[PDB]
Design an enzyme around this catalytic site. Structure first.
Site, PDB file in Angstrom:
ATOM      1  N   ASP A   1      -7.464  16.195   6.942  1.00 46.63           N
ATOM      2  CA  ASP A   1      -7.286  14.929   7.613  1.00 46.63           C
ATOM      3  C   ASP A   1      -6.178  15.305   8.543  1.00 46.63           C
ATOM      4  O   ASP A   1      -6.400  15.255   9.775  1.00 46.63           O
ATOM      5  CB  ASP A   1      -6.939  13.905   6.674  1.00 46.63           C
ATOM      6  CG  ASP A   1      -6.631  12.661   7.263  1.00 46.63           C
ATOM      7  OD1 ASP A   1      -6.816  12.544   8.793  1.00 46.63           O
ATOM      8  OD2 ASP A   1      -5.795  11.542   6.702  1.00 46.63           O
TER       9      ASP A   1
ATOM     10  N   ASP B   1      -5.903  11.780  -2.311  1.00 47.60           N
ATOM     11  CA  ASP B   1      -5.311  11.841  -1.080  1.00 47.60           C
ATOM     12  C   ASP B   1      -3.759  12.128  -1.218  1.00 47.60           C
ATOM     13  O   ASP B   1      -2.991  11.483  -1.831  1.00 47.60           O
ATOM     14  CB  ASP B   1      -5.511  10.780  -0.053  1.00 47.60           C
ATOM     15  CG  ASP B   1      -5.019  11.171   1.262  1.00 47.60           C
ATOM     16  OD1 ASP B   1      -4.460  12.314   1.607  1.00 47.60           O
ATOM     17  OD2 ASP B   1      -5.217  10.201   2.219  1.00 47.60           O
TER      18      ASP B   1
ATOM     19  N   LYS C   1     -10.324   6.082  -3.885  1.00 48.00           N
ATOM     20  CA  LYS C   1      -9.291   7.155  -3.196  1.00 48.00           C
ATOM     21  C   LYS C   1      -7.949   6.763  -3.731  1.00 48.00           C
ATOM     22  O   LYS C   1      -7.591   5.650  -3.549  1.00 48.00           O
ATOM     23  CB  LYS C   1      -9.488   7.166  -1.572  1.00 48.00           C
ATOM     24  CG  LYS C   1      -8.438   7.724  -1.088  1.00 48.00           C
ATOM     25  CD  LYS C   1      -8.475   8.048   0.435  1.00 48.00           C
ATOM     26  CE  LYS C   1      -7.194   8.179   1.199  1.00 48.00           C
ATOM     27  NZ  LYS C   1      -7.593   8.473   2.590  1.00 48.00           N
TER      28      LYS C   1
ATOM     29  N   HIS D   1       0.973  -1.057   0.026  1.00 52.81           N
ATOM     30  CA  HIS D   1      -0.074   0.027   0.035  1.00 52.81           C
ATOM     31  C   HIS D   1       1.046   1.184  -0.015  1.00 52.81           C
ATOM     32  O   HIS D   1       1.604   1.628   1.047  1.00 52.81           O
ATOM     33  CB  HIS D   1      -0.672  -0.142   1.314  1.00 52.81           C
ATOM     34  CG  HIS D   1      -2.213   0.741   1.000  1.00 52.81           C
ATOM     35  ND1 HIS D   1      -2.973   0.355   0.314  1.00 52.81           N
ATOM     36  CD2 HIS D   1      -2.667   1.655   1.645  1.00 52.81           C
ATOM     37  CE1 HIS D   1      -4.260   1.064   0.323  1.00 52.81           C
ATOM     38  NE2 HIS D   1      -3.920   2.172   1.239  1.00 52.81           N
TER      39      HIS D   1
ATOM     40  N   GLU E   1     -14.148   5.372   4.577  1.00 51.96           N
ATOM     41  CA  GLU E   1     -13.215   4.585   4.045  1.00 51.96           C
ATOM     42  C   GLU E   1     -12.675   3.453   5.092  1.00 51.96           C
ATOM     43  O   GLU E   1     -11.735   2.979   5.182  1.00 51.96           O
ATOM     44  CB  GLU E   1     -11.983   5.429   3.803  1.00 51.96           C
ATOM     45  CG  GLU E   1     -11.651   6.414   4.913  1.00 51.96           C
ATOM     46  CD  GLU E   1     -10.037   7.187   4.877  1.00 51.96           C
ATOM     47  OE1 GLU E   1      -9.843   7.250   3.501  1.00 51.96           O
ATOM     48  OE2 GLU E   1      -9.495   7.401   5.848  1.00 51.96           O
TER      49      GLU E   1
ATOM     50  N   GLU F   1      -7.886  15.477  -0.650  1.00 53.13           N
ATOM     51  CA  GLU F   1      -7.744  15.237   0.662  1.00 53.13           C
ATOM     52  C   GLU F   1      -6.378  15.874   1.084  1.00 53.13           C
ATOM     53  O   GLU F   1      -5.336  15.462   0.490  1.00 53.13           O
ATOM     54  CB  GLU F   1      -7.679  13.792   1.092  1.00 53.13           C
ATOM     55  CG  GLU F   1      -7.552  13.589   2.545  1.00 53.13           C
ATOM     56  CD  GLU F   1      -7.733  12.132   2.876  1.00 53.13           C
ATOM     57  OE1 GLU F   1      -8.207  11.234   1.976  1.00 53.13           O
ATOM     58  OE2 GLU F   1      -7.524  11.548   3.821  1.00 53.13           O
TER      59      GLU F   1
ATOM     60  N   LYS G   1      -4.011   7.549  -3.717  1.00 59.08           N
ATOM     61  CA  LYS G   1      -2.784   8.341  -2.990  1.00 59.08           C
ATOM     62  C   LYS G   1      -1.889   8.663  -3.951  1.00 59.08           C
ATOM     63  O   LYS G   1      -1.174   8.084  -4.888  1.00 59.08           O
ATOM     64  CB  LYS G   1      -2.337   7.047  -2.035  1.00 59.08           C
ATOM     65  CG  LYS G   1      -3.081   6.372  -1.146  1.00 59.08           C
ATOM     66  CD  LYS G   1      -4.040   7.428  -0.410  1.00 59.08           C
ATOM     67  CE  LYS G   1      -3.398   7.859   0.801  1.00 59.08           C
ATOM     68  NZ  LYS G   1      -3.354   6.958   1.886  1.00 59.08           N
TER      69      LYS G   1
ATOM     70  N   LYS H   1     -11.564  10.482  12.332  1.00 57.36           N
ATOM     71  CA  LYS H   1     -10.885   9.298  12.678  1.00 57.36           C
ATOM     72  C   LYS H   1     -10.464   9.141  14.111  1.00 57.36           C
ATOM     73  O   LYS H   1     -10.174  10.046  14.924  1.00 57.36           O
ATOM     74  CB  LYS H   1      -9.238   9.503  11.890  1.00 57.36           C
ATOM     75  CG  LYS H   1      -9.456   9.800  10.626  1.00 57.36           C
ATOM     76  CD  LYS H   1      -7.965   9.583   9.922  1.00 57.36           C
ATOM     77  CE  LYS H   1      -8.082   9.259   8.432  1.00 57.36           C
ATOM     78  NZ  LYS H   1      -6.396   9.269   7.968  1.00 57.36           N
TER      79      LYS H   1
HETATM   80  O1  LIG Z   1      -4.777   7.953   3.764  1.00 57.01           O
HETATM   81  C1  LIG Z   1      -4.647   8.231   5.171  1.00 57.01           C
HETATM   82  O2  LIG Z   1      -4.345   9.113   5.776  1.00 57.01           O
HETATM   83  C2  LIG Z   1      -4.883   6.969   6.072  1.00 57.01           C
HETATM   84  C3  LIG Z   1      -5.331   5.556   5.554  1.00 57.01           C
HETATM   85  C4  LIG Z   1      -6.865   5.891   4.847  1.00 57.01           C
HETATM   86  C5  LIG Z   1      -6.770   5.048   3.928  1.00 57.01           C
HETATM   87  C6  LIG Z   1      -5.702   4.800   3.534  1.00 57.01           C
HETATM   88  O3  LIG Z   1      -5.471   4.444   2.395  1.00 57.01           O
HETATM   89  O4  LIG Z   1      -4.755   5.180   4.639  1.00 57.01           O
HETATM   90 MG   LIG Z   2      -5.214  10.928   4.611  1.00 57.59          MG
END
Ligand SMILES: O=C(O)C[C@H]1C=CC(=O)O1
Ligand SMILES: [Mg+2]
Ligand SMILES: O=C(O)C[C@H]1C=CC(=O)O1
Ligand SMILES: [Mg+2]
Lengths: 371, 371
Positions: free
Chosen positions: B248, B197, B166, B21, B326, B223, B168, B272
């Site tokens: 976040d 994000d 989502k 991931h 999520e 995000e 990254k 969260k």
């Molecule tokens: O993204 C984040 O800040 C934390 C977490 C939420 C889903 C993911 O993929 O990581």
């Molecule tokens: Mg995040």
């Protein structure tokens, strides 16, 4: 590398204090330090210190979690790295480790100590060069008794130890604390500078009145009267308070210093290596404050001789510390782990030109007080 | 008291994941959880979970330091206290422990689980009452390959597993990441909602352009594009971005939520439990957002079944989660420590009406995966 880091050991040391120290949120009965022993391939050992107050009562890092995170995350990142390139090492930590400024502070202090020994220069010179050899040192009155505090202050004045006093308040009813503070200043008169530290204890509704009263009664500075979370309130208090306000807890990183300066949250900034991540990060915070016209104060988290001198060496390079310093940590402790304690006399801390932090461990004291 | 807390055990568990991931600051190869086992005098055990990402690469608390601080500071404060009065217990922690929200979240989750069993009610009802039984669940595409991400999204859509994705970004060159995101949205079209994000990876100078491009290409939410430290910049980006911005990392406590809302730092808040200090603290953050007209998103720190359900029970009480959730953490794990995993079907997570968090510990797997 010839100066490659070979090992990093963290040791938690428990030490006795001369008397109970009462903060708005915690009463200290003793003190605990985290010693960092960093050894390099060129046979040089650097010493550092990470210390806080009251476990987790003050900040999010405890002596215990500091040891855990350094051993589990910092050590693996630095072992094998060139200890002679401090900037590269600290940036390497910053890219993989969020927060943990207390831990980072101890690590950088050790690297600086080792680097100073390596070049035969005191840390102050590694940081650019000193502009003074001595730093004025304030003393904190926090016995929890007005009569006892006045007596202690008068003693420090007579012994020419301290002439600047910081009074801890916020634990009791506001009017009781104000009377306490006013009584102390009245007793000392012009022989001493009296300041207060509320450790975020007041609500803005209380502070707006309290600051007016303190300012009208000869109190020179008001440290962190309210929560660092009431950002707008701190700005408003600076306007209504006839006495300058100093940010301490509001600064938990260099970026906080910029935002506080941008918003106008305080006219004086406390400088603590533990809160910024070491002597170098603390100098960046000082640079921001200076650029913004904000006064400087040499702060402490009540470290022993190692952390106190690591802080001192950084403060020696500052053009001006308009609000002096509170580097009395080693004096609040009845025992430390240094062969020779820092040199205090005539209201100041005198820093030598010995290599690194100019200190040496007292292996016997360490072995005895280490946990 | 009959419900006095008798013991609190923290267990670090290492679990395998379905695939790497990739976050802007770290690539996950597996996941580590901290299990909290809280036993009361009335024979009831409550289970909680404190989990983060990448050791210290994401936040200042590591699974390791969480165990250290809970064992050394939280346990002593709670053993002997009435477990049936959660508000009093958490406030007791708050007055002596600064920060450590991840740790606090696990503790409160355990107390809620125990109190739910004690009263024979699911945690959602202890928190006021659920308004739905199911929660929409998004899926994070972070394989680091456009073709692979598209294929995975198509699989999840067709399995009726997820239809909200989502992405990254932030680890690569901006234009490369943008092309990646746009290619994915183009491949899925109207069959799915695509969001990104950036995990604070961009400078405002980069974000001001990137947000315009994303918003003009069918991306529904951006995000945390820049550092939580560039407070003024997040406000400016909300104005220039044609796509809504979600906070976040900017939220590290309930007070931050208020300040972000006051300043206008984001139009949507990620919720969260780990960042606020538990289900109850997260509901306070949600109340602040709702009161300010800010959208809500059910966030995660990639918790296993326990932490995900603790989060879910709180989200079930919210009038509206405009940006969904999520809560897919358990789906990232190939093995967990729950006898029965959470129930997912038709784009949602379905929460039962069983007492507490409605789950049972898999003792065999705990023994195998614990450290
Ligand atoms: O993204 C984040 O800040 C934390 C977490 C939420 C889903 C993911 O993929 O990581
Ligand atoms: Mg995040
Ligand atoms: O004041 C603080 O916040 C920390 C420390 C500095 C001296 C002292 O008495 O406590
Ligand atoms: Mg202070």
């Amino acid at each position: 590398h010839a100066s490659a880091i070979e090992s990093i050991e963290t040791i938690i040391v428990d030490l006795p204090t001369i008397r109970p120290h009462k903060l708005a949120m915690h009463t200290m009965q003793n003190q605990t330090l985290v010693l960092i022993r960093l050894r390099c391939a060129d046979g040089i050992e650097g010493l550092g210190e990470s210390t806080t107050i009251g476990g987790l009562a003050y900040g999010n890092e405890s002596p215990d979690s500091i040891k855990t995170n350094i051993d589990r995350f910092v050590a693996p990142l630095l072992i094998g790295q060139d200890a002679s390139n401090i900037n590269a090492a600290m940036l390497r930590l910053e890219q993989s480790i969020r927060g943990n400024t207390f831990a980072k502070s101890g690590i950088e202090s050790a690297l600086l100590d080792a680097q100073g020994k390596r070049l035969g220069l005191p840390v102050s010179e590694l940081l650019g060069g000193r502009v003074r050899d001595a730093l004025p040192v304030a003393w904190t009155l926090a016995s929890g008794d007005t009569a006892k505090d006045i007596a202690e202050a008068q003693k420090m004045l007579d012994l020419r130890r301290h002439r600047i006093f910081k009074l801890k308040i916020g634990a009791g009813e506001v009017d009781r604390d104000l009377a306490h503070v006013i009584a102390i200043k009245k007793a000392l008169g012009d022989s001493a500078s009296v300041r207060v530290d509320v450790n975020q204890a007041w609500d803005e509704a209380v502070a707006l009145r309290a600051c007016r009263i303190l300012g009208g009664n000869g109190i020179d500075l008001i440290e962190q009267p309210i929560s660092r979370n009431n950002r707008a309130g701190m700005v408003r208090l600076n306007a209504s308070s006839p006495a300058p306000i100093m940010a301490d807890e509001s600064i938990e990183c260099v970026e906080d210093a910029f935002n506080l300066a941008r918003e106008g949250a305080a006219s004086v900034f406390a400088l603590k290596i533990a809160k910024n991540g070491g002597p170098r990060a603390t100098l960046r915070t000082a640079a921001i404050a200076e650029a913004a016209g904000i006064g400087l104060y040499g702060g402490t988290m009540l470290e022993g001789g190692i952390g106190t001198l690591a802080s001192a060496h950084a403060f020696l390079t500052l053009n001006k510390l308009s609000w002096d310093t509170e580097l009395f940590g080693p004096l609040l402790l009845t025992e430390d782990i240094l062969a020779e304690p820092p040199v205090y006399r005539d209201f100041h801390l005198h820093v030598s030109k010995a290599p690194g932090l100019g200190l040496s461990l007292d292996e016997e004291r360490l072995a005895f007080f280490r946990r």
